[PDB]
């Protein structure tokens, strides 16, 4: 729901854009395509819906 | 007379084709059609033009 600073042991990888991949962002998993965004997130916001 | 009638009725989708790239290139706008397509809802063209 919000920014987190305590995380489990897991290795990160490089960002892959414009391709259908399995992603995991701070514990949230799914499938989709990543593209640059023009939205403006405030400092206390982590996800958009 | 047929010209006036067609202009008097507002239609949502002019055509029946919506390319994958176009929806991604228009993410900022909350297009209603792209939302339907990404959720498995489709509209089919009439046989008679």
Curated annotation (Swiss-Prot), chain A:
Function: Attaches the virion to the cell membrane by interacting with host receptor, initiating the infection. Binding to human ACE2 and CLEC4M/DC-SIGNR receptors and internalization of the virus into the endosomes of the host cell induces conformational changes in the S glycoprotein. Proteolysis by cathepsin CTSL may unmask the fusion peptide of S2 and activate membrane fusion within endosomes.
Organism: Severe acute respiratory syndrome coronavirus
Name of the protein: Spike protein S1
Residues represented out of the complete protein: 505 to 553 of 1255
Lineage: Viruses, Riboviria, Orthornavirae, Pisuviricota, Pisoniviricetes
Curated annotation (Swiss-Prot), chain B:
Disulfides per UniProt: 23-34
Region (Fusion peptide 1): 1-20
Domain of life of the organism encoding this protein: Viruses
Region (Fusion peptide 2) residue spans: 18-38
Function: Acts as a viral fusion peptide which is unmasked following S2 cleavage occurring upon virus endocytosis.
Stated name of the protein: Spike protein S2'
Boundaries of the shown chain within the full protein: 800 to 848 of 1255
